[PDB]
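Support case: zinc ion complex. Customer-provided input:
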Amino acid sequence: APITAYAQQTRGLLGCIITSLTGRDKNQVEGEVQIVSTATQTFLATCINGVCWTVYHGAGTRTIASPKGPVIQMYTNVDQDLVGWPAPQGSRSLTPCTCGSSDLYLVTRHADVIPVRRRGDSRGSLLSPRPISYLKGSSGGPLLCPAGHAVGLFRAAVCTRGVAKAVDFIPVENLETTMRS
Amino acid sequence: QVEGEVQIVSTATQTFLATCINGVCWTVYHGAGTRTIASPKGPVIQMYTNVDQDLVGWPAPQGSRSLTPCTCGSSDLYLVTRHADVIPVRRRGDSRGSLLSPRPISYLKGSSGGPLLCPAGHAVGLFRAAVCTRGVAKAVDFIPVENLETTMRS
Amino acid sequence: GSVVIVGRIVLSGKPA
Amino acid sequence: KGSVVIVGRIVLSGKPAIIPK
Ligand SMILES: [Zn+2]
Ligand SMILES: [Zn+2]
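Agent response - structure generated as follows:
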């Protein structure tokens, strides 16, 4: 079966700020990818193997709001640009890619999926380039293999005059390495 | 209101599928013929009619959403039927694919006009016809999305 | 006679 | 600093479906 995705908004600007300060979030959680926000920015967090992972450049050192109050990070790695929290109750986890494939599929915050060719263990190129603004807010989102398993997390676009030609990602192996230290 | 990319569609005599791609609602000429499509404001005229490719197009209706065309080059495809079943087919030529796993003919009936999807969920072609051996479909004809793209541009 | 739309399919399975 | 807050979600596990009338 093919990779298809939908986005749902669960919370507006004002509710997000309030929840940010109290750290207490009563909403029901569903899905594999969470749309995530701070005061300055919005990005993605991907659940893999029971852990909810995102980019350090987004979450910094922060807790995540949960039904029990704020939750502290389980993993933190400034160098790989990674953070992880326990996956929220109700989320569903992806599992790492174990096929060896180099045809990847990036899932953006608007729930579009875009083909990428793996070009090395941390880079891939867009088979069909898009303006950088199509990728804004997609940091921490998943790169998928054809069977829908996780190959990596989107980190940054590689672009040229505002057009994304390629993407840097954190390989799923860096996740295991972060978990070990 | 959630939108659909595929519409289930009917005439007096049959029922089949249409698929929205690039703002156009596309289906098979052998089903729609030269007909208009219904709307709350009255019938709407075909934007495109191409008897050779077996292709017709109308402006996309209210309640719909466009599928984006495939641009990876994959030959693992997925056919979506009128019951929302999905059946894997392997691409064999540019108009042709084989089901990984053959099905009775009735399983595919009423699905012409539906999409064939690449692994990314993008449109590779429109299901044209089942390729049948004694009531078992084991292959499919389809209209490659390039034809749709050409028909528009021309 | 026109073609009429009798139903819709959402490829992602997005609920109402 | 404030907590990170879930403001939405993306669901990969849904399959094609007929939209209920
Ligand atoms: Zn894999
Ligand atoms: Zn494709």
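Chain D touches chain C at residues 11, 14-21 (CB under 8 Å).

Case will auto-close in a few days if no follow-up is received.
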